[PDB]
């Protein structure tokens with residue numbers, strides 16, 4: 001629950017490595033590349049260069065090192081050597097690294113080639129829904145307020161939030177308490193405290209919120225075939241706000257968010 005300064009430092013390291021996988025893979029995300037190849041590149045980098053390990057491989061039996069979800073695929077897309085990226089594709093790459101016992105959990109959207117109207121819009125709105133949630137994190141606030149704020153913002157755009165999946169406490173365990181819902185729920189009642197580490201990872205559907213799992217047991221798609229986007233950051237709650245542990249160079253939000261004067 002409450003991380004020690006030394007545990008937080010390990011989180012900073014693990015968080016940076018996860019972020020750097022996403023920075024590293026960027027130039028490869030182009031038309032013609034396979035999702036299977038992107039997965040190999042990520043894994044080779046995590047293992048051989050970061051001297052770390054993917055938390056995703058073998059987790060609940062997951063066959064790959066990273067999750068790669070395209071378009072109407074909501075989450076848990078399986079990297080496949082035959083799956084080639086096309087122009088106009090929106091693509092999420094979700095990475096979780098373990099280094100020195102601690103987890104770093106992050107994802108971003110890439111748009112392949114020329115962005116379509118919906119693609120640009122959904123990805124922009126999804127990141128912003130994460131950003132506004134990030135700006136709310138500080139001691140004393142309830143997670144319900146944060147969930148409600150994401151949902152309100154997303155829905156005001158005419159989009160929907162996926163219910164089945166949520167952010168989560170993170171540390172030595174991939175998934176720890178608390179659950180971080182991206183919508184208002186009567187069972188959410190968690191007051192944020194300094195030292196808490198968790199993820200915020202809104203999945204946003206252009207259309208309806210309902211999802212469907214494929215016959216592979218893994219691939220989750222929107223039920224109405226609409227586009228779906230996701231961004232994720234791992235954070236630590238500080239005394240006066242939060243620090244984003246998985247911040248990248250392409251992030252347009254500061255690493256340290258303070259509400260003190």
Ligand SMILES: CCc1ccsc1-c1ccc(O)c(O)c1
Nearest residue numbers: 056059060062067076094105168
């Ligand atoms: C793909 C690994 C996996 C299996 C069941 S849930 C899950 C997963 C994937 C990405 C995440 O960010 C996460 O918190 C969990």
Ligand SMILES: [Mn+2]
Nearest residue numbers: 094095105106
């Ligand atoms: Mn993730």
Ligand SMILES: [Mn+2]
Nearest residue numbers: 105199201232
């Ligand atoms: Mn996660």
